[PDB]
Structure formats: C-alpha cells, structure tokens
Design a protein around this ligand. Sequence first.
Ligand code: HEC
Ligand code: HEC
Ligand code: HEC
Ligand code: HEC
Length: 107
Amino acid sequence: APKAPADGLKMEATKQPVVFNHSTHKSVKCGDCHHPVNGKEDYRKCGTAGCHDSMDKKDKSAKGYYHVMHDKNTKFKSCVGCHVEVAGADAAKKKDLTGCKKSKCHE
Ligand code: HEC
Ligand code: HEC
Ligand code: HEC
Ligand code: HEC
C-alpha cells in the first residue's frame, strides 16, 4: 500500500498554513480523517480541487475547507473537533490542540 506519507506535510491553502503529521495520528484511523466519499476510501488531500475548495471561510457547511479544520458541528470529526475531544478538559492541550494562537497548528 501507499501507507502514510512522509512527515512535515504542511498545507498553505490559506493565509494561515499548517503542518500535519501522520506519525502523530498513527493511533487515529485513516477513515477518521480520510472520511469515505461515495463509499470509496483513498488517501488524498483535503484541499483537493473539487473537494474542500470553497475559499469562502465564512460558510461553514462542508465545502468550507477552513470549516472542516475547525468547525466541530460537522458530520465528520474535524481537526479541532477531535482535538476538542482529545484535549477535552485537560488544559494546555486545548491550547496546543485547539488553540487559536500559540498552538500545535497555529504558531
Ligand atoms: C482557533 C479556534 C482558531 C482560529 C481562530 C483559526 N484556527 Fe486554524 N487552520 C488549521 C488548518 C489545517 C488550516 C488550513 C491550512 C491551509 O491550507 O492554509 C487553518 C486555517 C486557518 C485560517 C485561514 C483562513 C483565512 O484565510 O483566514 C484561519 C483564519 C484560522 N485557521 C483561524 C488548523 C488549525 C488547528 C489544528 C488542530 C487548530 C487548533 C486551529 N486551526 C485553530 C484556529
Ligand atoms: C487526520 C488525523 C488524519 C489521519 C488520521 C490520517 N490522515 Fe492522511 N492526511 C491528512 C490530511 C489533512 C492530509 C492532507 C493535508 C491537507 O492539507 O488536507 C493527508 C494526506 C495523506 C496522503 C497524501 C495524499 C496523496 O497525495 O496521496 C496520504 C497518502 C495519506 N494521508 C495517507 C494516510 C494513511 C495511510 C493514514 C492511516 C495510516 C492516514 N492518512 C491517516 C489527515 C489524516
Ligand atoms: C473529496 C474527495 C474530499 C476529500 C479529499 C476530503 N473531503 Fe471532507 N468532505 C467532502 C464532501 C463532499 C463533504 C460533504 C458532502 C457533500 O457532498 O456536501 C465533506 C465533508 C467533510 C466534513 C463535514 C463538514 C460538516 O458536516 O460540517 C469534514 C469535517 C471533512 N469533510 C473533513 C475532511 C478532512 C479532515 C479531510 C482530509 C483528511 C477531507 N475532508 C478530505 C469531500 C472530501
Ligand atoms: C481525532 C480523530 C483527530 C483528528 C480528526 C485530528 N487530530 Fe490532530 N491530534 C489527535 C491526537 C490524539 C493528537 C495527540 C496530541 C499530541 O499533540 O500529541 C493530535 C495531535 C496533533 C498535533 C500535535 C502533535 C504533532 O503531531 O505535532 C497537531 C499539529 C495536529 N494534531 C494537527 C491536526 C490537524 C491539522 C488535523 C486536521 C487536518 C488533525 N490534527 C486531525 C487527534 C486528531
């Protein structure tokens, strides 16, 4: 299989870039992020032309790339969404997991 990609996978599709890692979400199910679409599962980029490319930000619906990265009220687990569940009420983590500034995502 293609397995997980290398590390240092960052995405600069917005004025605020982010750096993701697969060696960190190893315990996380691939289907947890790479939600199934059409019933098929594949390893593609969220910001794929035709997937999450709304560049609206202020939309929060689905196409909102910046919505599937923060918005928690989504049909699927969101970055911050899951993070919120992970960090929960542990403090510090929610500042480096769901933190707006000075976090693991945004620095
Ligand atoms: C606190 C609730 C947060 C605020 C406010 C913002 N973020 Fe994030 N963020 C993350 C990713 C993966 C991206 C996309 C990277 C890319 O492709 O460019 C973003 C993007 C943004 C943006 C850009 C939208 C714009 O054009 O203004 C803004 C304004 C923004 N974020 C604000 C990832 C994460 C993340 C990882 C779990 C966290 C905790 C946050 N973002 C939290 C906030
Ligand atoms: C969220 C916690 C994720 C989990 C769990 C896994 N992946 Fe992932 N992967 C994620 C993102 C956000 C991205 C793209 C970054 C973006 O800007 O959206 C990726 C990318 C990949 C890719 C690259 C796409 C390609 O060109 O093929 C591959 C191959 C990939 N991911 C594989 C993969 C595997 C094998 C996973 C389980 C072992 C897995 N991912 C989990 C987010 C997340
Ligand atoms: C195209 C093949 C996609 C890729 C690659 C990813 N997503 Fe996606 N996602 C896609 C669609 C078409 C939809 C909505 C269904 C529709 O037709 O409208 C979604 C939805 C989400 C959601 C839910 C948002 C909500 O319900 O509020 C989330 C949280 C989400 N997607 C996240 C996400 C992540 C993290 C991805 C990379 C790991 C990713 N998506 C890739 C289409 C596609
Ligand atoms: C649960 C389904 C998750 C989803 C969806 C996303 N992440 Fe995550 N993340 C998760 C856990 C359990 C942890 C461990 C906490 C730790 O910091 O060790 C993390 C951690 C991160 C980190 C920090 C660690 C690192 O790898 O540098 C970052 C920067 C991070 N996560 C980013 C991230 C992004 C951008 C996501 C959406 C594309 C995302 N995570 C999804 C659990 C889950």
